[PDB]
């Protein structure tokens, strides 16, 4: 037909090793993204998954034809026969394209030489999460890309006005986080090979405290109230109060240990370590208070009579004041 | 055997007024419901193939609305050429049609 002769005439004397305007001007590349989904943001490896439809557009004066058809719409068969920019994601730990059932790529060449190249990617990008204020934290961690071999004087990238489009935002794999918005950025970075134009997309995420609540905040508080119930028990039943206190200590330790396996091996104190630490301290103080009570009923009874009645009102007020100050101080930040 | 129940069994209508026809399926038919028009002493003509897609040669006043079980066919500016019978038929399974609605003028 006519498309066969056009495609055969475009590829004669064509060199896919040389970018368009190899010694004239840098190539301008317009980039678009479509985030299909932002996958699970696991903090252990400090990474997150994302699925995008990456679209690039540029001008190639060698792929210019005169015909009655305006656009050649092609498969991935001709992607490896023309010049394709070497875009790579700078903060990706692992990234792969899609090849089932046929390489998920698209090439469209226009009447004036404008090439549009789209492909589907799944990226496992990297972002250091400052995991203070956990689990009441908010992050904004990027997806950056640039050319690998062509510096600023050879390839220039540029967003469009309708650059990044998210999908439905409800079919996404964000369990513990919530998408709030995005913003694009362009910059130039100095590298050992040259100056490169780098483009960034920052996704803003906020952690919803709905899993950590029913996992740790409710049970640890319940175990604290469990340690509280020892004060209303008679002061003569010594094995009862000792066993209650020390088994409550057991429950606190087990819950603390099983609760710390969500977050990574960070060395600073979070807003979750402080809570379970203070709960352990409270249980420790209740047991040591009963210990001093049992010593003081034998040493001098005038001091140990009204100590338990004081504890019955001092422990819940201290814990409630701690909760108020903690929650306001960590929700103001 | 998916049964299609079409309503109403008979209707009357004047010129230049909006009209709505409904088709209801017993089982699930995804978007494979089609609307045919049949004038007297003529063969049926496909108006809407699939749920909400006009056939080639159909005016822009017919429009369909689809769901899993409930389907609608609405005509806008009705002229004097819409005096015919209208059948809805499913194609998710072996095809079964509706009873039809005969539009008349009064």
């Amino acid at each position: 037909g006519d498309v066969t002769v056009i495609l055969n005439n475009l590829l004669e004397g064509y060199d896919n090793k040389l970018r368009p305007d190899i010694g004239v001007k840098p190539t301008l590349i317009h980039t678009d993204m479509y985030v299909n989904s932002i996958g699970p943001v696991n903090a252990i490896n400090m990474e997150y998954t994302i699925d995008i439809f990456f679209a690039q557009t540029w001008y190639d004066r060698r792929l210019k034809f005169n015909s009655t058809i305006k656009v050649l719409r092609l498969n991935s068969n001709m992607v490896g026969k023309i010049w394709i920019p070497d875009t790579f994601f700078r903060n990706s730990k692992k990234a792969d394209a899609h090849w089932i059932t046929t390489p998920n790529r698209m090439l469209r060449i226009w009447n004036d030489g404008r090439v549009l190249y789209t492909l589907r990617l799944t990226i496992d990008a990297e972002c250091q999460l400052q995991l203070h204020n956990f689990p009441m934290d908010e992050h904004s961690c990027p997806l950056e890309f640039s050319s690998y071999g062509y510096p600023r004087e050879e390839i220039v990238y540029q967003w469009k006005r309708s650059s990044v489009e998210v999908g439905d935002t409800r079919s996404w794999r964000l369990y513990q986080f919530s998408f709030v918005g995005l913003r694009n950025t362009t910059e130039v970075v100095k590298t050992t090979s040259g100056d490169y134009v780098v483009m960034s997309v920052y996704f803003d995420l906020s952690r919803r405290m709905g899993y950590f609540t029913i996992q740790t905040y409710i049970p640890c508080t319940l175990i604290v109230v469990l340690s509280w119930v020892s004060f209303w028990i008679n002061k003569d039943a010594v094995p009862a109060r000792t066993s209650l206190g020390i088994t409550t200590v057991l429950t606190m330790t087990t819950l603390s240990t099983i609760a710390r396996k969500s977050l990574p091996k960070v060395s600073y104190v979070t807003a979750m370590d402080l809570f379970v630490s203070v709960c352990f301290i409270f249980v420790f103080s209740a047991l040591v208070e009963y210990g001093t009570l049992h010593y003081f009923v034998s040493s001098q009874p005038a001091r140990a009579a009204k100590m338990d009645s004081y504890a019955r009102i001092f422990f819940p007020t201290a814990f409630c004041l701690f909760n108020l100050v903690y929650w306001v101080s960590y929700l103001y930040l | 055997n998916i049964v299609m129940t079409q309503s109403p069994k008979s209707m009357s209508m004047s010129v230049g007024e909006r009209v709505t026809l409904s088709c209801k399926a017993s089982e699930y038919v995804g978007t494979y419901v089609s609307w045919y028009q049949q004038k007297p002493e003529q063969s049926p003509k496909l108006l809407i193939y699939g749920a909400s897609n006009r056939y080639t040669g159909v005016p822009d006043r017919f429009t369909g609305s689809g769901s899993a079980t409930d389907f609608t066919l609405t005509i806008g500016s009705v002229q004097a050429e819409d005096l015919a019978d209208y059948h809805c038929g499913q194609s998710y399974s072996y095809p079964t049609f509706g009873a039809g609605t005969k539009l008349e003028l009064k």
Partner: protein, 254 residues
């Protein structure tokens, strides 16, 4: 034009180019200079005895066959021409699984200079292997290294060095490990001897010092608290036997 000139230059450079032979195949050895730009150090595993690092690994040498004088600019070529040129057979001796990234194309760079200098960069994610001495865990420091050697070419066929000799490895002050902290790093040049000949070797060694902030708040504070909660039984009189025995055994259980 300029595109035609560059096209005829690249077509002349690649016509009659023998990829089997290194530059100066009978003469002196070729000198290859290394740069490493460390993007990240991913996961330092003590159970698997390895670590993972992403790097921008660049090699620079001089091939007189890829020399041109008609155009005054440097030629960045599409990475597919690296399969038609000679590149050194550099390998890492202590790696377990490595790969070059492949999105959207193979992440590598090939650049020709008019004096014959070839610049060849790769983006690698290496899982290198290092045995750790955990006798002072978690108050320990680990020297973990990446060995860089030439496989086929001996020391009279190839020669390695660091490009800059102190600033050849960058991006080490920006590495954020969640459990360690880089205190120092060193670059070493030497030669190793195998039964097949003598080979050049470079070594990039990092000292990783482990933090204590997690281990304190996870092991050291609880154990001390449980010991105090075992001491509290001394303040209980010797009459109540059940209380003191239950307290001691449950501190043991904790």
């Amino acid at each position: 034009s300029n595109m035609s000139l560059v096209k005829e230059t690249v077509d002349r450079l690649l016509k009659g180019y023998d990829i089997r032979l290194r530059p100066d195949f009978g003469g002196p050895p070729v000198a290859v200079g290394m740069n490493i730009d460390i993007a990240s150090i991913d996961m330092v595993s003590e159970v698997n005895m390895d670590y993972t690092l992403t790097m921008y690994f660049q090699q620079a040498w001089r091939d007189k066959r890829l020399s041109y004088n008609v155009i005054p600019l440097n030629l960045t070529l599409d990475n597919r021409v690296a399969d038609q040129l000679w590149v050194p057979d550099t390998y890492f001796l202590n790696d377990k699984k490595s790969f070059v990234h492949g999105v959207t194309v193979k992440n590598r760079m090939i650049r020709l200079h008019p004096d014959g200098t070839v610049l060849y960069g790769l983006r690698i994610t290496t899982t290198a292997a290092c045995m750790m001495d955990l006798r002072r865990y978690p108050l320990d420091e680990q020297n973990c290294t990446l060995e860089i050697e030439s496989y086929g070419y001996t020391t009279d066929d190839i020669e390695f060095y660091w490009r800059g000799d102190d600033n050849a490895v960058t991006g080490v002050t920006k590495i954020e490990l969640p459990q360690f902290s880089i205190v120092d790093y060193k670059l070493i040049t030497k030669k190793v001897v195998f039964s097949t000949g003598s080979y050049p070797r470079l070594s990039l060694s990092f000292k990783l010092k482990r933090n204590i902030g997690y281990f304190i708040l996870q092991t050291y504070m609880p154990s001390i608290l449980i010991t105090i909660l075992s001491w509290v039984s001394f303040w209980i009189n010797y009459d109540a036997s059940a209380a003191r025995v239950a307290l001691g055994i449950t501190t043991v259980l904790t």
